[PDB]
Amino acid sequence: PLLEYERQLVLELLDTDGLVVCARGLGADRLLYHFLQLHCHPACLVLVLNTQPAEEEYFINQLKIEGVEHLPRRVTNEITSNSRYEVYTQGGVIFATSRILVVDFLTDRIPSDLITGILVYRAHRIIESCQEAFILRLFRQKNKRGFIKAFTDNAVAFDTGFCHVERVMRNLFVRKLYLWPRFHVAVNSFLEQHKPEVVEIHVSMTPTMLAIQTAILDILNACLKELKCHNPSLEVEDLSLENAIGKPFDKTIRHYLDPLWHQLGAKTKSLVQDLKILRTLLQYLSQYDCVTFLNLLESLRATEKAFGQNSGWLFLDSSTSMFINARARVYHLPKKELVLESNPKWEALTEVLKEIEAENKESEALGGPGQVLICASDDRTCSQLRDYITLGAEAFLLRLYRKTFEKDSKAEEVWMKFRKEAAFGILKEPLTIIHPLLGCSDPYALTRVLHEVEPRYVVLYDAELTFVRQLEIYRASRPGKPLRVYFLIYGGSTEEQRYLTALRKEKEAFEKLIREKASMVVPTQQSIVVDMREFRSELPSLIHRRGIDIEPVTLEVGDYILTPEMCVERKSISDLIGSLNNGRLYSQCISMSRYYKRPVLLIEFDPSKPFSLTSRGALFQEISSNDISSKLTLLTLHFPRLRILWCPSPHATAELFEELKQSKPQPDAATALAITESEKYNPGPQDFLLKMPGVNAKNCRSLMHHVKNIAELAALSQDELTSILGNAANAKQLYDFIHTSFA
C-alpha cells in the first residue's frame, strides 16, 4: 500500500543509495518492511543489522500474512557455527546480530561475494557503536558491488556537537543524504488532507503537587550546578536544567563520564546518583498516586538513615518542604484525618470516557459502536488506571492506603462522608483497551496495537512525539475511517516542558542537517587473537586496517595474543584504577604469568588530559597505600616478569602491536582458547548459590541436584541442611544467613 510521499522516498532510495533521516515516528518500520518485501527472494541474501526480536517477529508474521514463501530467517549465537553457513546459502532476508556478523566476516564463514546488499536499521548507532562500522568496512572490502541502504529516525542524534553527519555518512559508504522531516512539503501537504480530530485537555495540577515539583526542581538545579562546579570539563550546554528533565539525559551523562569514571572522585558519583534519584522522583510525582509517592519518599529516607545514600540533599531546607507537602497530600495530623487526594488527570480521563460513552450510546446505528484505546507510559500506570476505572477513586485510594499504611476504620468512614459532601460468544459491545506505550523499548508498538484493534477513539494519557506521528500516519493510511485522539497533558508541568523541548530539538536538528547537507554538496601474513568483548572499541578495527588479520575467540586469559608466548591486557587509566582497587588485576596477572612466558600490561593514557596517577594532597605527605602509584609499584614488584606498554591512543597501540611481532612466530586459536555441567546449571541462580556461605563447589554441586529451586531452599530447616550439605557448621551458617533481620 505505502503512501504518496513514502513512495517518492522509496523511489529515491531505489536510485543511488544513501541514508534516510525521517521525523520521529514517520513510519521508518514501514520503509524497512517495504524493502524486506522487495528482497524476500530466495535467489538473493541481504542482511538487516539493528532490529529487535519483537520487530523481527512482527515483520516475519506480517510477511507470512501477505502470503510470502521463503520468509526471513534470524541468525544468532545460539545456532552452531557450522550450521550458520547453511542459512547463509539459503538466501533471502537474514536478521543477524553485530557480534556473529563480525565473527563470520573475520573468519570468512560467509559468502561475502554472494551478499547482494545490507540494510542498516537505526543508522544513528553507527556514530558510537564501532562494531557496525567494522562490519561495513569488512563488507566493502570484499564485495564492492552490493548496496547499502540506511534508515533512521532520531534526527536529534546528529545534533550533538560531539558527532558530525559527514563522518557517519562516510562510515556507511553512501555519499547521498535524504532528509524527510515533518515540515517537508511532500509530507505536510499530504498529511493535511487526512488529519485526525485532535482535542486536548490541559489538566491543572494541584497546588500541593506544584510545591513538590518546585522543591524537586530546586534540588535538581542545585545538584546540577554543584556537578558542573566539580567538573569544569562538563560545563557543556548539554547539561542544562531543561535537558535534565528529558528522557535521554542519562545516556549523555554516561557518555560524558563512563570513560573516565574511576578518576572522577567521590562527590561526583554521589551527585550522579542524586540526579538519577531526583529524576525518578519527578517521574513518580507526575505519574503515580499520592500514597506511592509517600512510600518512595519515606523509603528514600530509610536507606539514608541506614547507609547515607542521599545525605547530601535529603536534609536540605527545600527537601523538608517536599516531605511536608507529600504528607499533607496523604495525611493530616491535628488520630489521622486522612485526606487521600487523587491527582486531577484521573478526573479528566473519567470525563473523556463519559463523553465517549455518550457518543457511542447516541450513534450506535451509524456503523458499529466503536472501540476506545488508552495509551499509558508504563505497566504501573496501566494497572493503576484499570483499578481506578473498575473500582472508583474512593475504593482504590482506600485499598492502597490500607495495603501500605496501618488499616483504620473509624478514621476511614469520616473521610468517606466528606468525599460525598455468556460463557462464549462475540462481545458486540464497546471495549476499552489499556496499552503500555513503552516508548524507549520499541516506540513502534502503538502501530501494531492500532492495526490489531481498530479504535474509533484514542486517549493519549501520556504523550510523546513518536506516538503523535504514529497516530497521524495511522489515520492517513485509512482515507475513509475517522478517529478522534484525546491529548491529556499536565498544564505547567515538566511533562509539557519535556514535550516542547523535544519538539524544538527535533526542528533545530533538522534545520542543522539541512544546512550541513547544503554545505557538503560540492565535495608474510600475520595474525592476532582478539577477545570477543574487545570489539566494542576501535583497536580491532585499526589492527585489521594495518594488513594483519584477526581471529576472534572468547579469551579467558588476556585480551590479545600477539605471539605464542605473549598476552596483552588492555586497560585505560580508569579501568586500571578500577582493577587495581577491586583486585581483578592481581588475579589477571597471576593467570597470565602462570600460562604465558611474556605477560604484558597495556595502559592507554590521554596526552590531551593527562592524569597525575597519584593521590591528590599526598604529593607532600607520606607514602599512601591507597594511592594508585603505590599499588602499581607493588604489583610490578610482585610480578617481575610483567612488562608494561604505555600508549597515548588506539592509533599508536596498533603501531606498537605491529612492531612487537617482527620475527616471532604467529599464534593460533584453540591453543589460547584451550588455556583456561557447562551446558547445565543455568548461570542465573548458579552464582547466587555459590555466593552464600556454606558452599564452595562440591557441597553446592551436590545439593542443587536434590533441591528443585532456591525458592523452596528457604523452606528447609537447619537439620535438613546438615543432612544434605554433609556438615553442621556450614549448614548452621547458611541457615543463619538466610533467616536474619537487618540488625
Binding site: P181, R182, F183, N188, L191, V198, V199, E200, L210, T214, L217, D218, N221, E242, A463, L465, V468, R469, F487, I489, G492, S493, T494, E496, Q497, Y499, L500, T501, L503, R504, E506, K507, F510
Partner: peptide
C-alpha cells in the same frame, strides 16, 4: 480549537523561541 500542542508538532508554524518554553518552569 487552540490545540497548539498538536499542530505544533508539524513544526510548520512561526513559533517564536518563548513558545517552546513554559512560563511556570522558569525557576
Amino acid at each position: 480549537k487552540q490545540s497548539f500542542l498538536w499542530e505544533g508538532s508539524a513544526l510548520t508554524g512561526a513559533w517564536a523561541m518563548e513558545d517552546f518554553y513554559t512560563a511556570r518552569l522558569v525557576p
